[PDB]
Amino acid sequence: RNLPSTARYIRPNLLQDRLNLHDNFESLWDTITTSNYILARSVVPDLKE
Amino acid sequence: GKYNLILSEYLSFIYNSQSAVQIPIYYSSNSELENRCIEFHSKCLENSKNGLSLKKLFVEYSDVIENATLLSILSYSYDKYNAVERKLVKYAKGKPLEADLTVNELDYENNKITSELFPTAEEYTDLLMDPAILTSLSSNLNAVMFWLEKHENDVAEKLKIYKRRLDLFTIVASTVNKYGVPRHNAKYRYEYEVMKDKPYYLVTWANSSIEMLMSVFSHEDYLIARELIVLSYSNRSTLAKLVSSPMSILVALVDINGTFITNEELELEFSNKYVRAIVPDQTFDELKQMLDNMRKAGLTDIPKMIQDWLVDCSIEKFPLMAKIYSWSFHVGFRKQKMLDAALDQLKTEYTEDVDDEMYREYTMLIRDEVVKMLEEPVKHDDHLLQDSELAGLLSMSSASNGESRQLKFGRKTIFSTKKNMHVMDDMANGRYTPGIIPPVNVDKPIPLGRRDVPGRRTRIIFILPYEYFIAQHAVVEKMLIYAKHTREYAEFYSQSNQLLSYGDVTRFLSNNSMVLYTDVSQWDSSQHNTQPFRKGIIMGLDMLANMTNDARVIQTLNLYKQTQINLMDSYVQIPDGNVIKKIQYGAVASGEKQTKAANSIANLALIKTVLSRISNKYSFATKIIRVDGDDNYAVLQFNTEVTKQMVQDVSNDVRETYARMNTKVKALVSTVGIEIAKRYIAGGKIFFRAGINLLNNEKKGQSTQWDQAAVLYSNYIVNRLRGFETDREFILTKIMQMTSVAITGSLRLFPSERVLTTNSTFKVFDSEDFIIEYGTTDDEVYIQRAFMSLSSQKSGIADEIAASSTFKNYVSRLSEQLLFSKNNIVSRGIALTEKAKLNSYAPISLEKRRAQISALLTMLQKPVTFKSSKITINDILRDIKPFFTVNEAHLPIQYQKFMPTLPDNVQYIIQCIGSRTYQIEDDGSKSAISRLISKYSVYKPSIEELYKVISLHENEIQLYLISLGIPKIDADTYVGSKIYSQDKYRILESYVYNLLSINYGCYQLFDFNSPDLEKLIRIPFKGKIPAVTFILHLYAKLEVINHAIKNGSWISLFCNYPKSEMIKLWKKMWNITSLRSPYTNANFFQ
Amino acid sequence: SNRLGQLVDLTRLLAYNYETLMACITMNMQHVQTLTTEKLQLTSVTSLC
Amino acid sequence: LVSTEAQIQKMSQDLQLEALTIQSETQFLTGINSQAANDCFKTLIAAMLSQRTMSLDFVTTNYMSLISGMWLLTVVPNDMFIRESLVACQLAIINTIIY
Amino acid sequence: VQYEILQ
């Protein structure tokens, strides 16, 4: 598909961590890191052969 | 150690009379105490034979009652006929049921009175509702009433179950008591004279309803059971087919969150992959129409249970569906007529409007696949093709049941269906002529058998002569051997004892892929299994004929070709009452050595041809195809993510692309799920179908009263693991009533837990489900030694058949067609081997097994036997046990659930150790002694025979192996090579595995290669006696596993076993006298 | 390489039909990248070639 | 047209994608049939007459598709094809065959 | 013996 210039799209806010949760928010960072770990497990490929 | 009390209570309840007396008999391995048991026996017989009170002696011999072991209980009660009704009147205070004749399509498929369908007995037949099982309806009713009576005083959740099942049995018994009970004859058939004035389909409905209501543990079970039992009384053709049909759509609605994979045939490697469920809209309209039919039939609660799940479409509430999918197949069989069952298949729509671009490609692909199978052996001139005649003639035992024909072995007449016996007959009378293949035409149409399975159509079975088998055998064995390592033959990719039974879909499931799965069981009368299919094979044979130089091989190929010529035009004998119909059916069905793999080929070619037509509108890469008989599935991956419209349009294109070859289909496309005959997947989790009727069978087998109880217990265990759970006490009541034997009109014997649960040819069940039991005691050892002496029995029929002239001629012809000039040194060996394959003929087996049971019974009556030292398994375990020490452990949970429907203890084990990952040879097929047998034959020899044969000198091994069709040079080479010493250990492995059901049942599902199980089994290593450390580690594993199953908790072990005992056991190794019954195995995959 | 003359034939035929159908046009045939776009399976092209 | 099964034969025995199996990839051939060739034959002519931009949709594993696509891009112009799919096709051709 | 014929 080609999209005209009449079209639009919204950009996400991808501004980095303003809080530094890896600096003495260890209880939150554990959950976050676990969340990204278990998410990453769902996308690493299976050893097909 | 609880069963015998239930036996006693059953006896007390069923008989209830002053005249009903109860007579235990005991035994002990210690002489003095045994003589006191003998005394008690004696005095009891006397007292019984003098109308004196028995209750006084029971104190005097208290020691025997506490420490000695029970065998059996006798029972003296007279005829006292019709007492079942005289008890049953109380449980029938509900309203009886009225049929509704305008439900089933046909007339005779309604549950109306026999006289409205068979006024004369000369045209009556009970075969359309025959349970075909050696157990009575009255047995079932008595069992239910005993359960209800003993559970008449409980106050718990059990009482909430009891009120429900009591209401169900009220609903049933009101209907029954309205007319009465049909009375079984000696053969467990039901004659005209009882059914003449009663409904024809009352028996199967009754039994099925009893089985269902005995499998109620929850509210939804009550709703489902009440909603099927009351409608299955009238509808008998469109019910299990109805509720079992939507499931195929429902699997396409469950999001995967977590997955299982397969690598090689039992490997797993789980994946946390998530996959959504891109279901189109029109399949919901289809599903809605199906539910409208469901409500239109008279179903209220179970659509609601199917309706409230769609609000979430969650996988946690989903096992209900799976439970429901098993509640459909426990209603019975649709035993309709041969005619109308054939016409489910014999409706044909053959048209000169199909493509020609498709069939020519189809034919060619079949040709090419055949050539891939047969290029190497046809070219390198393998021995097994040259001597295909002799190969098939040895392998006749692994064939189908030919049509009954009148034989005579000297001074008898036989109507055997076994084709080896047919061959024996035709050699003598000059009729054996395997090169001239018979036609199949008007002058000689073909018989039929019926392959049934509930909730589906009836398939047909060819029943051919013995030339067709011989032609097809060798070529089909090389084709199968080729398919052992080819992935795409789902029926046959294995490593010599397995199948890819956990599927190979879940590798490439993702947001971009889809999978089209399709039932192909109705594709037997179709236009693509006729002419093109046969002609492709004919073409392949032409190429292969030009791919060899020897003449025997070209003749064999020409005979296989001529077989396909005759199969291209084939007529079919079908009676209907008195007259006989014959219909042109020049196509494929089962009942042949070739049908399975060849249908797999043809479906593969068909799907490969169809799947190159979706390519006209989509770009995809075919990642995997699998074809197995009555189903097939292909996965395919896209350049992007999937939508509803691509699914819909692909489905329409697939449907129309099958229509272009004039082929009907309920085309099914999905993203997460499949449904097939033997299994189905939802959300990356394998479920299974629990549809094995226990109290009703498919056809009438040949087993005894005894062994059908064992078969039923295996099916019970299986169905329980699948999810369909029946209350175990009812099953035990059935087992005791089926092992009960009438010695007179009023004497009847009932064995005990310690006779039925011991490893022998008489094992039936286990005291604790999912656990075989062994013997650490004197007494279990004692009786095992006794029963092995009695398991070996004779068959006078076999002895007299082997002494006639025709059998002798057959052995002589085998010899001189194989080797000559040793007419009194090997030929006798060949006769002894032919004896090993006469036993397939059923009456011989019945003679032998009835002899075993009678010999058993003449020491169940009287006291016990010492059996003279013959070593068995419990002798070994007796010596392994006293150097153990148990300690409490605590394993964590690190393995994933993928069979939710299991009981929670087995799942807890699977959720703490792994699931099995290999499959080690029950047959020892990979063993170097067996790779000769699989090269020159197909023959089994049972692991008892191999374990015995290896124990002999190096001389008779040659005789025994050459007698199995093998030549002499390779046997001599095997003995000189000293490979049997490299195979004692494998054979013993397989032997011990067969003895202990390690590849048969629950133990097939467990990882003994685990690191977690191993660290508990701390038996240090000594070395150079591998068998002992092997059995020690295995038995210690079994200890831990049995403790886990029976108590949930875990334990460790430790065995600092002394070398002295290592050496004492090394000599006891290869002199074992033990055996396990064939009828006791419970294959989870049937 | 061994479909040479057949593809010669195809190319001439295609161009011929294009020009002879071009002749049956009355509005200026102008070139633009449109919004949506016809699919074309290269497997169909292999079937053709 | 040519009978399809002949071409299937020679393509099968020279490509031999039974041999070029990882082990699971069932790499038998994909669409060669009639009633797709003429679909394309209509598509090309009608798109060039209408000046309808048409895109490509393929799987690079089927390198035969690209071997036919290079002919296609040769004879049919390049400004008729949307640039993204054209670039994709060309780039697969270069990274697979030429360099 | 008895026979009825279809095609």
CATH number of the domain that B181 lies in?
A: 1.20.120.1390
Which residues from B are below 8 Å from A36, CB to CB?
Answer: none
Residue bearing tokens 């390690």: B998
Which chains lie within 8 Å of chain D at 3 or more CB pairs, if any? A, B, C
CATH code, B480? 1.10.357.80
The number of helices, as runs of H, and strands, as runs of E, in chain B is 43, 20
**Where is B1041: in which H helix or E strand?**
helix B1026-1047
Helices (H) and strands (E) counted in chain A, each on its own, are: 1, 0
**Are there at least 3 beta-carbon pairs closer than 8 Å between C and E?**
no
DSSP state of B414: B
Nearest CA-CA partner of B409 in B795, B832, B794, B806: B806
Q: Which helix (H) or strand (E) holds B906?
A: helix B904-910
Burial letters for B742-764: b for 16+ Cβ neighbours within 10 Å, e otherwise?
A: eeeeeebbbbbbbbbbbbbbbbb
Size of interface B-C (CB pairs under 8 A): 13
Closest approach of chain D CAs to the CA of C31, in angstroms? Answer: 6
Q: Provide CB contacts within 8 A for B850, sequence distance 6+.
A: B704
CA distance B828 to B822: 10
Q: Which residues of B touch D (CB under 8 A)?
A: 357, 360-361, 364-365, 368, 372, 487-488, 504, 507, 608, 611-616, 618-625, 639
Residue B199 per-residue DSSP state: B
Count of domains observed in chain B: 8
- Whether C contacts D, i.e. 3 or more CB pairs less than 8 A apart, is yes
Tokens representing B177? 């008591």
Distances (CA, A) of B839 to B448, B936, B941: 24, 21, 12
- Which of A42, A46, A47 shows the shortest C-beta gap to B274? A42
CA distance E2 to B648: 53
Whether residues B221 and B363 fall in one domain: no
Same domain, B107 and B124: yes
Task: Please name the method used to determine this structure.
Answer: cryo-EM
Alpha carbon B933 to chain centroid distance? Answer: 25
Residues B611 and B752 in one domain: no
CA distance D83 to chain A (A): 10
How would you list the strands of the sheet with B674-675, edge to edge?
Answer: B674-675, B680-681, B686-687
Helix (H) or strand (E) holding D91: helix D83-93
Same structural domain for residues B93 and B203? yes
Query: Chain B: nearest CA to A18, how far in angstroms?
Result: 31
- Strands B887-888 and B741-742, by their bridges, are unpaired
Q: How far apart are CA D86 and CA B576, in angstroms?
A: 68
Residues B725 and B848 in one domain: no
| φ and ψ of B849, to 5 deg | -75, -40
Q: What is the phi-psi region of residue B363: left when phi exceeds 0, alpha when psi lies from -120 to 50, beta otherwise?
A: alpha
Continuous H helices in B463-505: 467-485
Are the C-beta atoms of B463 and B449 separated by less than 8 Å? yes
Let me know whether B101 and B177 are in one domain: yes
Extract the tokens encoding B333.
Answer: 């069989």
Q: In what order do the strands lie in the sheet with B632-638?
A: B620-627, B632-638, B513-518, B668-670
E strands, B585-658, are 620-627, 632-638
Distance CA B240, CA B245 (A): 8
Structure tokens at B820: 């000559």
CA distances from B1034 to B792, B998, B1019 (A): 28, 10, 11
Scan for tokens 């759970």, then name that residue. B725
For B641-675, give the DSSP string: ---HHHHHHHHHHHHHHHHTTT-----EEESS-EE
* CA of B613 vs chain C CAs: smallest distance (Å): 10
Can you tell me the distance from the alpha carbon of B934 to that of B932, in angstroms, rounded to the nearest whole number?
5
- Are B185 and B231 found together in one domain? yes
Touching, E vs A (3+ Cβ pairs under 8 A):
no
Please report which helix (H) or strand (E) contains residue B72, including its range: strand B69-76
Instruction: Give the domain range for residue B787.
Output: 397-437+766-867
CA of C3 vs chain B CAs: smallest distance (Å): 21
**Which of B513, B564, B499, B577 lies closest to B538 in space, CA to CA?**
B564
Helix then strand count (H, E) for chain D reads: 4, 0
Count the helices and strands in chain C (H runs, E runs): 2, 0
Return the half-sphere exposure (C-beta side, CA atoms, 13 A cut-off) of residue B846: 9
DSSP SS3 for B568: helix
Scanning A1-49 for CB atoms below 8 A from D yields: 2, 48-49
Nearby residues of B688 by Cβ (< 8 Å), 6 or more positions away: B678, B679, B680, B722, B723, B899, B901
- Select from B594, B614, B643 the last residue of a domain: B594
Residues in chain C: 49
Considering only CB atoms, which chain E residues are within 8 Å of B583? 6-7
Question: How many CB contacts within 8 angstroms connect chain B with chain D?
Answer: 66
Phi-psi group of B279: left, alpha or beta (phi > 0 → left; psi -120 to 50 → alpha; rest → beta): beta
- Same domain for B930 and B913, yes or no, is no
CATH number at residue B495: 3.30.70.2480
Is residue B227 helix, strand or coil? helix
User: From A6, which residue of chain C is nearest by alpha-carbon distance?
Assistant: C35
Structural contact between residues D80 and D53, judged by C-beta atoms closer than 8 angstroms: yes
The tokens describing B70, both together, are: 């029970």
Q: What are residue B604's phi and psi, to 5 degrees?
A: -65, -45
Q: Which CATH number does the domain housing residue B1000 bear?
A: 1.20.120.1400
**Same-domain status, B290 and B222:** no
* Distance separating alpha carbons of residues B418 and B396, to the nearest angstrom: 8
B19-44 burial code (b ≥16 CB/10 A, e <16): ebbbbbbbbbbeeebbebbbebbebb
Exposure class string for B449-468: b at 16+ Cβ within 10 A, else e: bbbbbbbbbbbbbbbbbbbb
Contact B756, B762 (CB under 8 A): yes
Return the residue matching tokens 């396990």.
B1076
Strands (E), C1-49: none
Q: Between chains, do B261 and A42 touch, taking CB under 8 Å as contact?
A: no
Residue B75 parent element (H or E): strand B69-76
Closest CB from B273, B274, B507 relative to A48: B507
Mutation site for A-interface testing, chosen from C32, C33, C35 by largest number of A Cβ within 10 Å: C35
Q: Where are the beta strands (DSSP E) in B336-493?
A: 449-451, 459-461
**B397-433: b (≥16 Cβ within 10 Å) or e:** bbbbebbeeebebeeeebebbbbbbbbbbbbbeeebe
Closest CA to B671 of B188, B270, B143, B273: B273
DSSP conformation letters of B756-782: HSSSSTT----SBTTB-----SHHHHH
Measured in whole angstroms, how far is the alpha carbon of residue B310 from the centre of its chain?
35
Residues of C with CB under 8 A from a CB of B: 39, 41-44, 47
Which residues of B fall within a CB distance of 8 Å from C44? 615-616
Q: Does B705 lie in the same domain as B671?
A: no
CA B528/CA B519 separation, integer angstroms? 15
Residues near B137 by Cβ (< 8 Å), separated by ≥ 6? B131, B181, B182, B184, B203, B206, B207
List the CATH number of the domain containing B1039: 3.30.230.140
Indicate if B355 and B377 belong to the same structural domain.
yes
Interfacial residues of D (vs A; Cβ cutoff 8 Å): 22-24, 53, 82
DSSP element (H, E) containing B680: strand B680-681
d(CA B166, CA B150) in angstroms, rounded, equals 12
Are residue B775 and residue B860 in the same domain, yes or no? yes
- R_g of chain A computed on alpha carbons: 18
Give, in order, the Cα–Cα distances in Å from B311 to each of B40, B41, B219, B245, C14.
69, 68, 21, 20, 55
* B329 to B690, B700, B720: CA distances (angstroms): 8, 19, 14
| CA-to-CA dists, residue B19 to B46, B52, B78, B266, B917, angstroms | 16, 11, 8, 58, 58
Q: How many residues are given for chain A?
A: 49
D32 neighbourhood in chain C, CB within 8 Å: 43, 46-47
B123 in the Ramachandran plot: left (φ > 0), alpha (ψ -120 to 50) or beta? alpha
Q: Tokens representing B937?
A: 């034959």
